Design an enzyme around this catalytic site. Structure first.
Site, PDB file in Angstrom:
ATOM      1  CG  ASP A   8       9.752  10.734 -39.103  1.00  8.29           C
ATOM      2  OD1 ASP A   8      10.255  11.930 -39.270  1.00  8.29           O
ATOM      3  OD2 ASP A   8       8.748   9.882 -39.157  1.00  8.29           O
ATOM      4  NE  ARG A  42       9.284  13.248 -32.742  1.00  2.00           N
ATOM      5  CZ  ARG A  42       8.239  14.026 -32.281  1.00  2.00           C
ATOM      6  NH1 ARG A  42       8.196  15.060 -32.660  1.00  2.00           N
ATOM      7  NH2 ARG A  42       7.649  13.562 -31.472  1.00  2.00           N
ATOM      8  CG  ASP A  53       5.827  16.658 -45.853  1.00  2.41           C
ATOM      9  OD1 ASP A  53       6.246  16.839 -44.581  1.00  2.41           O
ATOM     10  OD2 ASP A  53       5.901  17.711 -46.426  1.00  2.41           O
ATOM     11  CB  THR A  54       0.349  13.240 -45.872  1.00  2.00           C
ATOM     12  OG1 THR A  54       0.098  13.073 -44.497  1.00  2.00           O
ATOM     13  CG2 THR A  54      -0.685  11.977 -46.663  1.00  2.00           C
ATOM     14  CD  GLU A  78       0.118  10.179 -54.530  1.00  3.98           C
ATOM     15  OE1 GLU A  78      -0.841  10.259 -55.550  1.00  3.98           O
ATOM     16  OE2 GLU A  78       1.326   9.403 -54.909  1.00  3.98           O
ATOM     17  NE  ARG A  82      13.439   8.200 -30.065  1.00  2.00           N
ATOM     18  CZ  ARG A  82      12.400   7.956 -30.827  1.00  2.00           C
ATOM     19  NH1 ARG A  82      11.846   8.696 -31.751  1.00  2.00           N
ATOM     20  NH2 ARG A  82      11.773   6.681 -30.397  1.00  2.00           N
TER      21      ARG A  82
END
Length: 110
Positions: free
Chosen positions: A21, A35, A40-41, A43, A87
């Site tokens: 990031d 940043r 997301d995550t 899977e 950032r």
């Protein structure tokens, strides 16, 4: 409640990615860290894990595409609430395609 501001396109050459990031971006001769927002995550949908399980796509690919393409424009706003100068929000992409858009479309080639 949420005010949608007009985000302009600014060119910035990403020198190198840090933790996926927070990445450095040469902004008009004056580099600034950024940043991303796309969180997301792996899977799953897009919850908490901006750094999906791929390996290089973040630190190895992020700045890589920037060094291979002569066009790195960040879709960042000109009113991003930053802390100091690292950032800032943005969607760094090389040759039109974003680093995340690289292989995260088929499942990040590992």
């Amino acid at each position: 409640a949420t005010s949608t501001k007009k985000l302009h396109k600014e060119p910035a050459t990403l020198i190198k990615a840090i933790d996926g990031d927070t990445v450095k971006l040469m902004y008009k001769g004056q580099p600034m860290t950024f940043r991303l927002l796309l969180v997301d995550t792996p899977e799953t949908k897009h919850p908490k894990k901006g750094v999906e399980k791929y390996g290089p796509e973040a630190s190895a690919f992020t700045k890589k595409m920037v060094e291979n393409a002569k066009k790195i424009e960040v879709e960042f706003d000109k009113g991003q609430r930053t802390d100091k100068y690292g950032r800032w929000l943005a969607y760094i992409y090389a040759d039109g395609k974003m680093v995340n858009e690289a292989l995260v479309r088929q499942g990040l080639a590992k």
